[PDB]
Amino acid sequence: MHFTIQREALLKPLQLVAGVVTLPVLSNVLLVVEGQQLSLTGTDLEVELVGRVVLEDAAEPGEITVPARKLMDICKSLPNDVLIDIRVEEQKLLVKAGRSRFTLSTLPANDFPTVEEGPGSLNFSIAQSKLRRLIDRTSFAMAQQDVRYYLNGMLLEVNGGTLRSVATDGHRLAMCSLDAQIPSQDRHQVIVPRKGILELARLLTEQDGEVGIVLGQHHIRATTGEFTFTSKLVDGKFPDYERVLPRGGDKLVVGDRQQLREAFSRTAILSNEKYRGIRLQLSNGLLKIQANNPEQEEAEEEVQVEYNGGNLEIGFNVSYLLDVLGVIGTEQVRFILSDSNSSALVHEADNDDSAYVVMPMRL
Amino acid sequence: MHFTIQREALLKPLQLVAGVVETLPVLSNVLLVVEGQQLSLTGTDLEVELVGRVVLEDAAEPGEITVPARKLMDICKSLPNDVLIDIRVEEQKLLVKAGRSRFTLSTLPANDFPTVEEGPGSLNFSIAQSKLRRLIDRTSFAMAQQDVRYYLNGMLLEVNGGTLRSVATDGHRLAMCSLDAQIPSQDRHQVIVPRKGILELARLLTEQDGEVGIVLGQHHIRATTGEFTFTSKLVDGKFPDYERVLPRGGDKLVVGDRQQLREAFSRTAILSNEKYRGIRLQLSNGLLKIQANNPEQEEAEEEVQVEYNGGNLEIGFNVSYLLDVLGVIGTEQVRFILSDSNSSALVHEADNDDSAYVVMPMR
């Protein structure tokens, strides 16, 4: 195995694969030269990322794994635009560029873990920005290290022509729905584990770009010109999210998103550091927000909101409210509430595309 | 105690004192004192005391109290820009008001807050802030972190003739900087300022066109500006005879590009032992060969052209130590003075003997 490559050409995909990179082989990147193509692969056994770069000078084929962080750091630290000569010699990777010589230890290609790569049951393409939006609008809702396996990840659902993302930790929910012109078929649902979905969202930087998606029984695949991403899915059945969404809420409240966010963060300072309880007292054209902690400290704040109807005292985790408010993209925010024991449904001002559910706390 | 103050006016000094609060509970409080039309804010960690003063505009009722520093600062930070804040003590509580936001904080009495009694010292002078900071910035890395020899964990500030000098050393390497300061001194004065205090002092010296008033005493060092008075306790002990540490017999003089050497040392550092950080230098006429090996038999090799004429030298150094020096050398070139493999290296700027750096070899 031997090739030459520019520092920049190698660094781009090598930085991509290094973002996914404990068994020792898992900290290596798999390098494969087939013809004039270099493929770089990184995996953490849940997610596999592959980067492809075209080689210009003649290249001798082969394959090998080398420590990813160390190759990337070596490549990063080299002078700009320098040509790098990479060769395998006696279980070692030899790297030459200019007047610098590096020898790296290697593990055999066969040791590197592989993925099933099935055709799947559905595929479509979509604008990277649209897929990224579904994830960014809902990702905070995901549960972290919950015993229920399904909670630690994001549901992606195709139904009719519609792509939908749902995330919930069992206390709060975030859902977003987009018209994707996906051909009508049966409902398709996948649960992409938390780490993989966040990684995927970060990867979708091409604003005018497309992403090819494959849904299977055990994997999702995202493919673009730069990379091919594969994640294992969460085995299990996602809860019926439809039941969680509150319905028939009598009270409707409209408020300035920025004023509510600032008033909630101000009061949050003196709320219980673990439970983050905030008390809301709603009355005609008025929201009182109060916060108390174990040291008997108190923050109070009043905000004028558009609201007409019965008084309502209700408790909510302030962090949850702030998570919602920080993804609402409109100046105003709509809150839909019923009673003290019932959850809140939050929408953008004019749009039902994203919906947020926040269950209350006992006061 | 009762006063009104603009949010911006209160935040500046509050932010300053908050940087020294890290536990006994009163140590995480800020001491607030209203005397006439002045508000003083005091923070301490029992080694360093920082005081901020602000002139109050509206009438103010005097008194004193301590309140949690971080919480007051966060509350002040989160408030609307340019708002007027009303502060008043009521029944062992601080009541903070601004617009429609009410806050009640728990308080501890002023008696509990530690007091530092400030003598006049034996020497005082003023100096440009940026000169004092330079002394510290050029020299701070050399300090020991948690050595058993207490004097090493700090920086020596010495006044001899009209020269202000800073010395730091962990026993493996040394950093010194000397500046003419026209300071009248009948006798030589030494102080050892603890590392937390000296680093904090450096960060506070932010006015490039400003001056700082210094007092040296037997047990304290005091630094005064319009914005603050910083007092630190000193390390009780005699600082080592640093002059003996400096190498005198060097027969080999090397000149090199600072940026090329830095880049070549960081590149080779990647494959050096992660704990011992050993690099090998091979010096011959016009050339420096840098090699790094680790326990996994990985190797980085690099050559740099340098101005040098004389006998061959093989010598080992900790590469972090060399990089620490190179990252504070302000000139495009750097001078290395060496003698033998078992003897220390002396490093200077290109044209100047003002800063001097000593690094002991490995092996």
XYZ file of C-alpha atoms in Angstrom:
726
model
C 0.000 0.000 0.000
C 1.478 3.319 -1.058
C 0.079 6.709 -1.982
C 0.775 10.429 -2.135
C -1.750 13.051 -1.076
C -1.938 16.777 -0.279
C -2.176 17.730 3.369
C -5.541 19.385 2.876
C -6.963 16.523 0.833
C -6.218 14.011 3.541
C -7.130 16.250 6.464
C -10.763 16.907 5.515
C -12.046 13.271 5.539
C -9.621 12.382 8.314
C -11.171 15.117 10.515
C -14.644 13.778 9.569
C -13.864 10.169 10.585
C -12.066 11.308 13.766
C -15.334 12.837 15.078
C -16.795 9.314 15.526
C -13.692 7.683 16.986
C -12.560 1.168 24.675
C -11.099 -1.644 22.443
C -7.883 -0.452 20.696
C -8.981 -1.029 17.046
C -11.794 1.498 17.636
C -9.307 4.298 18.034
C -7.787 3.419 14.611
C -8.932 4.665 11.228
C -9.249 2.048 8.460
C -7.442 3.128 5.289
C -8.204 1.319 2.015
C -6.612 2.152 -1.329
C -8.583 0.680 -4.316
C -7.380 2.049 -7.631
C -7.152 5.831 -7.311
C -9.451 6.086 -4.310
C -8.658 6.347 -0.638
C -11.397 5.444 1.819
C -11.111 6.320 5.482
C -13.348 4.593 8.023
C -13.988 5.253 11.706
C -16.358 3.505 14.083
C -17.451 3.294 17.722
C -19.483 0.081 17.029
C -22.758 2.011 16.856
C -21.873 4.423 14.100
C -19.614 3.967 11.103
C -18.352 6.933 9.096
C -16.601 6.688 5.727
C -14.700 9.388 3.874
C -13.558 9.171 0.260
C -10.755 11.094 -1.413
C -9.457 10.812 -4.984
C -5.732 10.104 -5.332
C -3.896 11.810 -8.194
C -0.483 10.164 -8.473
C -0.235 6.435 -9.046
C -1.085 4.463 -5.933
C -0.322 0.928 -4.857
C -3.387 -0.763 -3.281
C -3.860 -2.326 0.153
C -5.449 -1.734 3.500
C -4.443 -1.030 7.095
C -5.582 0.582 10.350
C -3.633 3.275 12.205
C -4.367 5.451 15.265
C -6.828 8.091 14.096
C -6.121 10.944 16.500
C -2.327 10.549 15.918
C -2.593 10.489 12.090
C -4.905 13.509 12.168
C -2.660 15.459 14.575
C 0.351 14.659 12.401
C -1.537 15.755 9.273
C -2.861 18.924 11.008
C 0.595 19.975 12.224
C 2.238 19.732 8.834
C 2.952 22.751 6.690
C 0.314 24.022 4.395
C -0.142 22.341 1.002
C 2.671 19.808 1.551
C 2.532 16.487 -0.313
C 2.374 13.508 2.038
C 3.815 10.101 1.113
C 2.206 7.200 2.969
C 3.503 3.656 2.843
C 3.027 0.397 4.742
C 6.262 -1.387 5.698
C 6.455 -4.302 8.184
C 3.322 -3.549 10.211
C 4.127 0.152 10.386
C 2.780 3.165 8.564
C 5.501 5.424 7.237
C 4.592 9.043 6.696
C 6.867 11.388 4.792
C 6.320 15.008 4.034
C 9.014 17.533 3.373
C 11.643 16.895 5.970
C 9.440 15.182 8.512
C 9.310 11.471 9.042
C 6.720 9.599 11.091
C 6.346 5.943 11.930
C 3.022 4.769 13.309
C 2.001 1.430 14.754
C -0.707 -0.418 12.904
C -3.397 -3.019 13.393
C -4.460 -5.413 10.604
C -7.426 -4.479 8.395
C -9.241 -7.718 9.320
C -9.346 -6.665 12.995
C -11.460 -3.603 12.040
C -15.208 -4.201 12.664
C -17.612 -4.389 9.717
C -21.280 -3.461 9.147
C -24.085 -5.473 7.452
C -24.955 -2.865 4.784
C -28.350 -4.230 3.720
C -30.492 -2.590 0.994
C -33.231 -1.739 3.489
C -36.980 -1.271 3.060
C -37.146 2.452 2.124
C -34.907 5.092 0.573
C -35.342 8.709 -0.429
C -33.284 11.821 -0.712
C -33.865 15.116 1.033
C -32.274 18.545 1.481
C -29.581 18.347 4.169
C -30.984 21.492 5.788
C -34.461 20.003 6.086
C -33.171 16.837 7.748
C -30.921 18.936 9.966
C -33.842 21.095 10.976
C -35.898 18.122 12.085
C -33.077 17.002 14.333
C -32.093 20.402 15.773
C -35.659 21.246 16.620
C -36.120 18.069 18.594
C -32.793 16.674 19.882
C -32.792 18.263 23.374
C -35.901 16.245 24.234
C -34.017 12.941 24.020
C -33.440 11.015 27.235
C -29.885 10.343 28.334
C -28.917 6.973 29.851
C -32.532 6.074 30.624
C -33.310 2.456 31.496
C -35.961 2.405 28.781
C -33.791 1.884 25.706
C -36.173 3.544 23.228
C -36.006 6.898 25.009
C -32.267 7.384 24.380
C -32.593 8.390 20.748
C -34.738 10.022 18.112
C -37.668 8.484 16.273
C -37.692 9.228 12.554
C -41.010 8.363 10.920
C -42.101 8.345 7.297
C -45.871 8.364 6.705
C -47.818 9.514 3.727
C -45.232 11.863 2.213
C -44.174 13.182 5.623
C -40.878 12.956 7.491
C -41.179 13.325 11.245
C -38.794 13.456 14.179
C -39.893 12.758 17.814
C -37.744 12.887 20.930
C -38.876 12.360 24.503
C -37.327 11.674 27.905
C -40.695 10.688 29.378
C -41.168 14.099 30.985
C -41.066 16.250 27.867
C -41.581 15.820 24.142
C -40.336 17.478 20.970
C -41.750 16.746 17.538
C -41.267 18.289 14.073
C -42.964 17.382 10.763
C -41.912 18.195 7.228
C -43.502 17.601 3.792
C -40.856 15.563 2.005
C -42.608 14.225 -1.066
C -41.601 10.724 -0.108
C -43.693 8.278 -2.024
C -46.657 6.772 -0.268
C -45.944 3.413 1.269
C -46.450 1.888 4.672
C -45.448 3.651 7.840
C -41.773 3.399 8.521
C -40.302 4.132 11.906
C -36.712 4.007 13.115
C -35.091 4.931 16.418
C -31.636 6.344 15.863
C -29.518 6.279 19.025
C -28.742 9.604 20.635
C -25.019 9.752 19.827
C -25.563 8.909 16.167
C -28.338 11.414 15.518
C -26.408 14.361 17.000
C -23.362 13.338 14.981
C -25.500 13.113 11.820
C -26.945 16.585 12.397
C -23.472 18.108 12.741
C -22.386 16.375 9.522
C -25.079 18.036 7.386
C -23.268 21.289 6.620
C -23.992 21.587 2.889
C -26.801 24.110 2.712
C -27.596 23.570 -0.982
C -26.775 19.872 -0.607
C -28.828 16.700 -0.633
C -28.560 13.627 1.531
C -29.587 10.102 0.488
C -31.324 8.189 3.295
C -31.850 4.431 3.630
C -34.115 3.001 6.366
C -33.754 -0.626 7.322
C -34.627 -2.983 10.143
C -31.305 -2.569 11.929
C -29.569 0.445 10.288
C -29.996 3.927 8.874
C -27.670 5.217 6.208
C -27.011 8.786 5.250
C -25.081 9.345 2.049
C -23.624 12.452 0.521
C -20.816 13.284 -1.810
C -18.381 13.598 1.061
C -19.408 10.796 3.388
C -21.425 7.655 4.005
C -22.815 7.433 7.520
C -24.255 4.307 9.055
C -25.840 3.917 12.472
C -27.310 0.962 14.269
C -30.897 1.478 15.428
C -32.500 1.046 18.797
C -34.213 -2.293 19.010
C -37.539 -1.922 20.601
C -40.719 -0.066 20.005
C -41.059 3.652 20.413
C -44.002 4.685 22.633
C -47.223 5.956 21.158
C -46.321 9.635 21.142
C -49.803 10.598 19.978
C -51.250 9.784 23.404
C -48.669 12.008 25.138
C -49.717 15.171 23.289
C -52.313 17.061 25.332
C -55.671 17.631 23.677
C -58.728 19.726 24.473
C -56.803 22.400 26.318
C -59.113 25.225 27.422
C -56.569 28.010 28.051
C -54.534 29.687 25.316
C -51.637 31.996 26.075
C -49.530 34.128 23.765
C -46.309 35.809 24.842
C -43.085 37.342 23.619
C -40.559 34.528 23.302
C -37.578 36.669 24.304
C -39.285 38.240 27.339
C -40.406 34.823 28.625
C -36.926 33.334 28.083
C -35.226 36.166 29.965
C -37.786 35.993 32.815
C -37.467 32.227 33.092
C -33.604 32.371 33.171
C -33.664 35.186 35.747
C -35.953 33.232 38.028
C -34.158 29.962 37.337
C -31.145 31.290 39.226
C -33.005 30.856 42.527
C -34.835 27.667 41.731
C -33.840 24.318 43.232
C -30.544 23.348 41.537
C -31.663 19.714 41.042
C -35.502 19.885 40.577
C -35.623 23.321 38.891
C -39.155 24.048 39.982
C -40.835 27.217 38.878
C -44.329 28.311 39.842
C -46.625 29.975 37.365
C -49.687 31.993 38.268
C -51.707 32.839 35.229
C -54.549 35.343 35.223
C -56.111 37.730 32.726
C -53.293 39.411 30.821
C -50.664 38.377 33.357
C -48.064 35.674 34.136
C -46.340 35.610 37.518
C -43.263 33.446 37.675
C -41.869 32.494 41.041
C -38.911 30.447 42.145
C -37.865 29.194 45.574
C -34.867 27.121 46.696
C -33.949 25.172 49.918
C -32.115 28.273 51.294
C -35.502 30.206 51.244
C -34.287 32.482 48.458
C -36.961 33.743 46.067
C -37.097 35.204 42.586
C -40.398 36.704 41.361
C -41.147 38.167 38.001
C -44.250 39.370 36.181
C -44.709 39.336 32.428
C -47.725 40.544 30.466
C -49.081 37.844 28.184
C -52.143 37.669 26.004
C -54.537 35.489 27.956
C -58.230 35.547 28.903
C -59.834 33.010 31.228
C -59.737 31.234 34.573
C -56.841 31.528 36.988
C -54.266 28.780 36.856
C -51.491 27.848 39.245
C -49.089 25.356 37.678
C -45.564 24.048 38.155
C -42.903 23.317 35.570
C -39.245 22.400 35.348
C -37.684 25.675 34.164
C -34.946 24.016 32.128
C -37.594 22.281 30.044
C -39.337 25.566 29.334
C -36.011 27.190 28.378
C -35.138 24.274 26.059
C -38.379 24.824 24.178
C -38.094 28.612 24.063
C -34.540 28.357 22.660
C -35.742 26.454 19.568
C -38.953 28.454 18.914
C -38.197 30.526 15.839
C -40.917 33.130 16.045
C -41.213 36.346 18.045
C -44.278 35.068 19.836
C -44.950 31.695 21.418
C -48.253 29.939 22.030
C -48.838 27.940 25.128
C -51.777 25.600 25.445
C -52.755 24.617 28.973
C -55.663 23.027 30.786
C -55.279 22.271 34.495
C -52.542 21.989 37.141
C -52.087 18.229 36.606
C -52.051 18.488 32.815
C -49.164 19.111 30.437
C -48.394 22.119 28.253
C -48.327 22.130 24.484
C -46.165 24.811 22.952
C -46.164 25.995 19.327
C -44.607 28.652 17.165
C -46.846 31.705 16.575
C -48.371 30.749 13.148
C -47.280 27.163 12.650
C -48.187 23.713 13.962
C -45.119 22.073 12.283
C -43.148 21.779 15.514
C -44.989 20.920 18.732
C -43.559 20.693 22.274
C -44.971 18.917 25.293
C -43.963 19.719 28.849
C -45.497 17.891 31.759
C -46.045 19.747 34.970
C -44.524 19.388 38.367
C -46.409 19.179 41.657
C -46.447 22.412 43.674
C -28.072 49.456 54.096
C -29.831 50.754 51.039
C -28.607 51.952 47.663
C -29.410 52.211 43.969
C -26.933 51.412 41.226
C -26.909 50.877 37.472
C -26.557 47.278 36.326
C -23.360 47.951 34.399
C -21.833 49.887 37.291
C -22.425 47.021 39.703
C -21.396 44.227 37.350
C -17.830 45.376 36.686
C -16.501 45.109 40.267
C -18.819 42.208 41.015
C -17.317 40.328 38.089
C -13.848 41.196 39.358
C -14.393 39.976 42.917
C -16.173 36.860 41.707
C -12.965 35.613 40.068
C -11.348 34.986 43.475
C -14.252 33.216 45.159
C -13.757 29.469 44.757
C -15.300 25.482 51.617
C -16.386 27.606 54.674
C -19.619 29.293 53.445
C -18.746 33.000 53.979
C -15.847 32.556 51.549
C -18.291 32.121 48.710
C -19.959 35.434 49.700
C -18.996 38.911 48.598
C -18.700 41.547 51.342
C -20.714 44.667 50.498
C -19.998 47.893 52.404
C -21.714 51.229 51.861
C -19.719 54.133 53.452
C -21.085 57.487 52.360
C -21.463 57.422 48.579
C -19.108 54.513 48.033
C -19.783 50.819 47.599
C -17.001 48.369 48.257
C -17.122 44.786 47.074
C -14.751 42.274 48.645
C -13.922 38.693 47.692
C -11.382 36.357 49.267
C -9.997 32.804 49.189
C -7.872 33.371 52.364
C -4.698 33.913 50.339
C -5.853 36.642 48.008
C -8.249 39.485 48.758
C -9.749 41.536 45.943
C -11.599 44.794 46.536
C -13.723 46.777 44.106
C -15.061 50.275 44.721
C -17.852 52.127 42.984
C -19.242 55.615 43.464
C -22.954 55.664 44.215
C -24.980 58.515 42.690
C -28.325 58.565 44.525
C -28.469 58.872 48.288
C -27.430 55.692 50.035
C -28.044 54.432 53.544
C -24.870 52.872 55.032
C -24.227 49.372 56.361
C -22.557 46.136 55.512
C -23.437 42.551 54.672
C -22.227 39.428 52.834
C -24.228 37.676 50.096
C -23.412 34.732 47.763
C -21.112 36.135 45.094
C -21.856 33.944 42.091
C -25.644 34.298 42.702
C -25.533 38.110 42.972
C -23.349 38.303 39.858
C -25.592 35.953 37.847
C -28.648 37.927 38.924
C -26.944 41.198 37.928
C -25.716 39.706 34.608
C -29.181 38.428 33.654
C -30.944 41.740 34.223
C -31.974 44.151 31.440
C -29.274 46.400 30.038
C -28.887 49.797 31.742
C -31.520 49.065 34.402
C -31.288 50.614 37.869
C -31.002 48.094 40.676
C -32.368 48.678 44.154
C -30.536 46.873 46.936
C -31.573 46.799 50.565
C -31.012 44.658 53.666
C -34.166 43.491 55.490
C -34.141 40.853 58.283
C -30.952 39.015 57.287
C -31.885 39.018 53.600
C -30.715 41.011 50.607
C -33.657 42.285 48.590
C -32.760 43.043 44.990
C -35.142 45.014 42.805
C -34.976 46.029 39.170
C -38.030 46.779 37.059
C -40.490 44.042 37.825
C -38.024 41.409 39.002
C -37.701 40.768 42.738
C -34.927 38.703 44.237
C -34.306 37.725 47.888
C -30.860 36.321 48.772
C -29.684 34.803 52.060
C -26.990 36.707 53.870
C -24.214 36.181 56.335
C -23.121 38.924 58.731
C -20.117 41.162 58.028
C -18.341 39.953 61.213
C -17.934 36.482 59.711
C -16.080 37.818 56.662
C -12.285 37.573 57.096
C -10.381 40.817 57.476
C -6.919 41.625 56.186
C -5.139 44.398 58.096
C -3.081 46.453 55.666
C 0.274 47.851 56.856
C 2.352 50.286 54.797
C 5.077 47.741 53.990
C 8.786 48.455 53.453
C 8.716 49.435 49.739
C 6.261 51.003 47.328
C 6.439 52.156 43.747
C 4.240 52.438 40.740
C 4.783 50.799 37.385
C 3.082 50.407 34.004
C 0.535 47.600 34.196
C 1.796 46.049 30.999
C 5.376 45.977 32.311
C 4.389 44.049 35.421
C 2.220 41.676 33.443
C 5.055 41.038 31.009
C 7.301 39.986 33.911
C 4.658 37.519 35.048
C 3.536 36.320 31.593
C 7.089 35.685 30.409
C 7.838 33.816 33.630
C 4.628 32.081 34.956
C 4.907 28.654 33.235
C 8.152 27.806 35.072
C 6.454 27.779 38.509
C 5.951 24.473 40.295
C 2.326 23.456 40.745
C 2.139 21.414 43.950
C 5.711 20.900 45.050
C 6.614 20.015 48.646
C 9.200 22.765 48.576
C 6.631 25.540 49.113
C 8.775 28.353 47.695
C 8.742 26.747 44.242
C 4.973 27.016 43.932
C 4.961 30.729 43.236
C 6.942 33.524 41.731
C 9.750 35.581 43.160
C 9.476 39.321 42.607
C 12.748 41.089 43.326
C 13.772 44.723 43.413
C 17.499 45.413 43.189
C 18.958 48.730 42.108
C 16.150 50.134 39.998
C 15.326 46.765 38.456
C 12.147 44.748 38.884
C 12.744 41.030 38.431
C 10.550 37.938 38.252
C 11.857 34.409 38.807
C 10.031 31.073 38.579
C 11.309 27.511 38.702
C 10.024 23.997 39.406
C 13.551 22.670 39.919
C 13.726 21.275 36.398
C 13.530 24.537 34.509
C 13.682 28.229 35.182
C 12.282 31.455 33.799
C 13.451 34.970 34.597
C 12.675 38.477 33.346
C 14.322 41.782 34.257
C 13.043 45.261 33.550
C 14.501 48.645 34.403
C 11.907 50.377 36.534
C 13.837 53.293 38.047
C 12.598 52.133 41.450
C 14.470 53.769 44.271
C 15.455 51.119 46.753
C 17.894 51.306 49.553
C 18.112 47.572 49.774
C 17.263 44.488 47.764
C 13.698 43.354 48.315
C 12.392 39.843 47.560
C 8.831 38.485 47.769
C 7.398 35.111 46.764
C 3.834 35.423 45.565
C 1.847 32.138 45.479
C 0.908 30.838 42.043
C -2.849 31.366 42.325
C -2.310 34.967 43.384
C 0.325 35.821 40.780
C -1.701 34.372 37.886
C -4.786 36.218 39.096
C -2.760 39.424 39.344
C -1.588 39.015 35.753
C -5.170 38.609 34.479
C -6.232 41.802 36.216
C -3.541 43.962 34.679
C -5.626 44.701 31.566
C -5.103 48.430 31.061
C -2.321 48.829 28.516
C -2.135 52.583 29.125
C -2.619 52.192 32.855
C -0.448 52.137 35.951
C -0.452 49.973 39.074
C 0.701 50.935 42.589
C 2.689 48.189 44.335
C 3.421 47.707 48.038
C 5.917 45.065 49.238
C 5.686 44.010 52.847
C 6.828 41.228 55.123
C 3.696 39.110 54.678
C 1.788 40.760 51.769
C 1.997 42.256 48.344
C -0.522 44.913 47.433
C -1.504 46.058 43.964
C -3.692 49.117 43.471
C -5.522 50.630 40.496
C -8.604 52.825 40.228
C -10.669 49.695 39.727
C -9.183 47.484 42.439
C -6.886 46.747 45.353
C -5.400 43.269 45.271
C -3.766 41.803 48.316
C -2.023 38.499 48.442
C -0.280 36.639 51.184
C 3.331 35.685 50.485
C 5.071 32.342 50.691
C 7.073 32.271 53.893
C 10.486 30.879 52.981
C 13.696 31.854 51.211
C 13.662 31.553 47.460
C 16.566 29.498 46.115
C 19.777 31.063 44.844
C 18.660 31.251 41.246
C 21.925 32.748 40.009
C 23.748 29.444 40.746
C 21.158 27.593 38.663
C 22.042 29.575 35.539
C 24.593 27.787 33.370
C 27.844 29.619 32.692
C 30.091 27.288 30.725
C 28.335 27.195 27.376
C 30.597 26.868 24.374
C 28.046 26.074 21.687
C 25.813 28.912 20.534
C 22.826 28.197 18.348
C 20.529 30.542 16.478
C 17.280 29.362 14.897
C 13.935 30.567 13.619
C 11.552 30.493 16.572
C 8.513 29.528 14.499
C 10.277 26.696 12.619
C 11.633 25.236 15.879
C 8.210 25.478 17.564
C 6.467 23.719 14.682
C 9.174 21.003 14.511
C 9.096 20.422 18.261
C 5.243 20.152 18.324
C 5.230 17.836 15.345
C 7.785 15.508 16.901
C 6.091 15.876 20.345
C 3.115 13.918 19.018
C 5.145 10.694 19.087
C 7.094 11.396 22.277
C 6.350 9.541 25.502
C 3.054 11.036 26.762
C 4.346 11.247 30.364
C 8.166 11.868 30.035
C 7.941 13.834 26.772
C 11.505 13.014 25.731
C 13.009 14.337 22.507
C 16.562 13.764 21.273
C 18.585 16.574 19.686
C 21.495 15.944 17.421
C 23.416 19.044 16.668
C 26.090 19.440 14.028
C 27.220 22.357 11.867
C 24.232 24.071 10.445
C 21.827 21.457 11.534
C 19.498 20.195 14.197
C 17.959 16.804 14.117
C 14.995 16.219 16.375
C 13.846 12.667 17.147
C 10.959 11.387 19.292
C 10.211 7.779 20.275
C 7.379 6.346 22.395
C 6.695 2.932 24.098
C 4.742 1.726 20.999
C 8.017 2.033 18.899
C 6.599 4.986 16.940
C 9.110 7.585 15.746
C 9.023 11.171 14.555
C 12.149 12.604 12.927
C 12.696 16.148 11.821
C 15.525 18.355 10.639
C 15.812 22.093 10.960
C 18.568 24.313 9.614
C 20.070 26.471 12.276
C 23.036 28.783 12.590
C 25.641 26.808 14.509
C 29.375 26.023 14.147
C 31.269 23.576 16.352
C 31.425 20.083 17.812
C 28.611 17.562 17.544
C 26.188 17.330 20.475
C 23.629 14.708 21.335
C 21.297 15.864 24.093
C 17.864 15.076 25.493
C 15.139 17.476 26.658
C 11.567 17.444 27.803
C 9.855 18.887 24.693
C 7.053 20.572 26.653
C 9.684 22.585 28.447
C 11.213 23.705 25.161
C 7.747 24.602 23.765
C 6.922 26.617 26.888
C 10.023 28.700 26.335
C 9.501 29.100 22.583
C 5.892 30.259 23.151
C 7.048 33.255 25.239
C 10.080 34.274 23.099
C 8.934 37.468 21.359
C 11.525 37.637 18.543
C 11.656 35.964 15.140
C 14.910 34.220 16.188
C 15.989 32.403 19.336
C 19.410 31.809 20.874
C 20.303 28.533 22.563
C 23.469 28.251 24.611
C 24.617 24.707 25.315
C 27.732 22.971 26.527
C 27.363 19.211 27.076
C 24.727 16.465 27.251
C 24.683 16.495 31.075
C 24.468 20.303 31.278
C 21.512 22.712 31.165
C 20.381 24.792 28.211
C 20.134 28.595 28.344
C 17.696 30.335 26.002
C 17.453 34.068 25.132
C 15.601 36.343 22.756
C 17.606 37.299 19.623
C 19.035 40.726 20.701
C 18.297 40.860 24.396
C 19.409 39.336 27.683
C 16.272 40.679 29.488
C 14.539 37.311 29.638
C 16.589 34.162 30.252
C 15.358 30.546 30.293
C 17.059 27.478 31.730
C 16.164 23.913 30.884
C 17.884 20.901 32.392
C 18.493 17.965 30.060
C 17.099 14.461 30.218
C 19.167 11.305 30.592
